[PDB]
Write a protein that binds this ligand. Structure first.
Ligand SMILES: c1coc(CNc2nc3ccccc3[nH]2)c1
Length: 168
């Protein structure tokens, strides 16, 4: 069986806990609790093939910098999730990308750009911003609304295909 090493990252105030739980047991929790290290693995059918998704959600604080290079050495797919309500996270994506690219040590990297909290009326970061920024990276941007379950699975399937075809 094929294992997809994916890691969930982002900023504080986005709610990665809801993103992980929604994809695992299919539940949405409004409660925000900072998780450090939890195991999130589930078998999903990708394009007619059942595969095991090995996902590890990590911290998003600057307090945890030493363990950064650790999970970045095993994780193949980095889930850079930001929030449209937080324009800071939009910028932090570049810094995070820089750190990731620093560990990856490669220009070509199959990653995606997804944002949460798209259900909030306080949209600080508009679509044009992300869509235009994606042009510089060379990777598409996907809107992930875990609130109403829109784009959740869709954005996850594309990532797998990009990585699968890259291994071929
Ligand atoms: C118990 C503790 O970790 C596990 C699963 N391992 C695991 N390695 C990973 C490396 C990168 C991303 C997710 C990963 N997930 C089970």
């Amino acid at each position: 069986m094929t294992e997809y090493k994916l890691v969930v990252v982002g900023a504080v105030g986005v709610g990665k806990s809801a993103l992980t739980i929604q994809l695992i047991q299919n539940h949405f929790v409004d409660e925000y609790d900072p998780t450090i290290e939890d195991s999130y693995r589930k078998q999903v059918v990708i394009d007619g093939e059942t595969c095991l998704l090995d996902i590890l959600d990590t911290a998003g604080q600057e307090e945890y910098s030493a363990m950064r290079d650790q999970y970045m050495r095993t994780g193949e797919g980095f889930l850079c999730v930001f929030a449209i309500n937080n324009t800071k996270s939009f910028e932090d994506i570049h810094h995070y990308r820089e750190q990731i690219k620093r560990v990856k040590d490669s220009e070509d990297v199959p990653m995606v750009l997804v944002g949460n909290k798209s259900d909030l009326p306080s949209r600080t970061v508009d679509t044009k911003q992300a869509q235009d920024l994606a042009r510089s990276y060379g990777i598409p941007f996907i809107e992930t609304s875990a609130k109403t379950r829109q784009g959740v699975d869709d954005a996850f399937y594309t990532l797998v295909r990009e990585i699968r075809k890259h291994k071929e």
